[PDB]
Amino acid sequence: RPARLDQLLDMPAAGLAVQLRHAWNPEDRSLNVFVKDDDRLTFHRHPVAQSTDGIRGKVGHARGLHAWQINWPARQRGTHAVVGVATARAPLHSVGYTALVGSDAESWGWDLGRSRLYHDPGVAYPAFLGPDEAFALPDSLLVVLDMDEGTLSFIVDGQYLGVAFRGLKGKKLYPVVSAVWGHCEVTMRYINGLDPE
Amino acid sequence: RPARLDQLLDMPAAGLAVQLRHAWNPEDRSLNVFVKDDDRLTFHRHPVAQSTDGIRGKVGHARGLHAWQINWPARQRGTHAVVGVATARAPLHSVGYTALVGSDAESWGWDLGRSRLYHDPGVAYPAFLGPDEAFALPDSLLVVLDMDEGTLSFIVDGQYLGVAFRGLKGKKLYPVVSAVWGHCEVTMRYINGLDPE
Ligand code: NI
Ligand code: NI
Incomplete structure (x- = not known):
């Protein structure tokens, strides 16, 4: 579904x-993470x-096609390391170890460790992965948000991996x-956006 | 290659x-890990x-078919989390982040994060994984060492995954x-062994 994605990139x-x-x-975080004092692009x-x-x-x-880059070294990351988007109502902390991005109706995420998609559950992505298989991700990916079509997708090392979620029109997602x-x-770096007219 | 493995299990x-x-x-460890005081089966x-x-x-x-269980929660584990066997001469610490089990001629390992086999390099295992693919491992696996045939292999959740390494006869491997x-x-639990006559 890269529509104006080639233009954006x-x-x-x-x-x-x-x-x-x-x-x-x-100021929109778990009490147990912090944005670094000398790097406002990176939380710890x-x-x-x-x-x-x-x-x-x-x-x-609420609008436009948007792309940002996530650096999360592969080293620092196992199961329930989730990248995605959420309403302003998504719980940002829980007691225990969970798939909190994708916990309820308020968030959509990709487990980088399990290669599984979360939202309320447990679906495989990219779809070409077989049973018991995971995509071997490097240190960075691209999160591509299309609030005009209402989809979420990802790029890894130049490869567009497919639409991960749909049904996201009419919301405001971070x-x-x-x-x-x-x-x-x-780390997260906003790459660019194409707003509508 | 499960030869007397069904008997062992x-x-x-x-x-x-x-x-x-x-x-x-x-007393055979990196200065930066320790065996726990109340759990001598688990290092931290x-x-x-x-x-x-x-x-x-x-x-x-130096001998026999042997099987041990490794518990390493998937959560606590990304790339360069290596399980395997080594001569008594394998370096057990390095400065930096490396595939240290599999670094040289003295060790053989499976990266649980990358699904790659290390020894001197970088081969895929289980072999049925495709390019850019990893096996999605749970919290535990079985390491199956055959010092009679001279092979290393693994079981995960009941599935024998194949011979990972060969050429291990005539050595003493831990x-x-x-x-x-x-x-x-x-955690590691020795499961059992069948010695030769
Ligand atoms: Ni810290
Ligand atoms: Ni500690």
């Missing part, structure tokens, strides 16, 4: 000021017993992430 | 005394900057593990 990527406006929101998870922790981006998209393990650091 | 599993004799060696990794840390089991096998990330806890 041909644009020079947005510079630092736009990247920062679209970045992790230091700082755990205590049995917690799943999330953070939303500053901008909720870059979100949730992690269950370790002192992870997840 | 039909035996009642070894009890706690045998499990402990075959367990992690608190306790990191500092840029380190890859290993631990070997107490018993080096359960080994290396981890690069987080405060992982890896």
Whole structure:
């Protein structure tokens, strides 16, 4: 479904000021993660017993085709390391280890460890993966949000991987992430957007 | 290649005394992991900057078909989380993040995150995985060592996954593990062995 995606990716990527406006929101997060003091593009998870922790981006998209880059080293990431989008009503912390992005009707996510899609559950993505199989992801991916068609999809190392979710029109959705393990650091860079007329 | 493997697995599993004799060696380890004070079957990794840390089991096998169970929650595990076997000469620490089990001629390992086999490199396992694919492992696996035929293989949730390495006759090889990330806890239980006559 890359509609104006080739156009969006041909644009020079947005510079630092736009990247920062679209970045992790230091005031819309689990009490157990923080945006770093010298890198406002990167949050750090700082755990205590049995917690799943999330953070939303500053901008909720009701509109346009948008693309952002997530760096999460593969090393720092196992199961229930989820990348996706969420309503402003998605719980951003839980007690225990869960798929919190995708927990309820308020969030949609891709488990980078399991290659499974979450939303209320447990569907495989990319669809060409077989049973007991996972896509071997590198340190970064692209999250492609289309609030005009109402879909979510991902690119990894140049490959468009398919539409992951549909039915997202009429909502306002932010870059979100949730992690269950370790002192992870997840960078996000807004790449670009094409707004409607 | 399950030769006497069906016989080995039909035996009642070894009890706690045998499990402990075959367990992690608190004196054959990276200075940055420790065997837990109240659980001598489990090591805990306790990191500092840029380190890859290993631990070997107490018993080096020159002989027999042997099987042990590794519990490493999937959550606590990404790339360069390696399970395997090593000569008594395998480095058990490095400065930086590497595939240290499989680093040189002295060790053989399976990256649970990448589904790749290491030894000197980078081969896929199970072989039926395609390009860019990984096997989605659960919290535990079986390491099956055959020092009579000289092979290493793995079982996951009842499925024998194939011979991973060959050419291991004439050596003495220990359960080994290396981890690069987080405060992982890896349990190992020796399951059983069939010695030759
Ligand atoms: Ni921390
Ligand atoms: Ni620790």
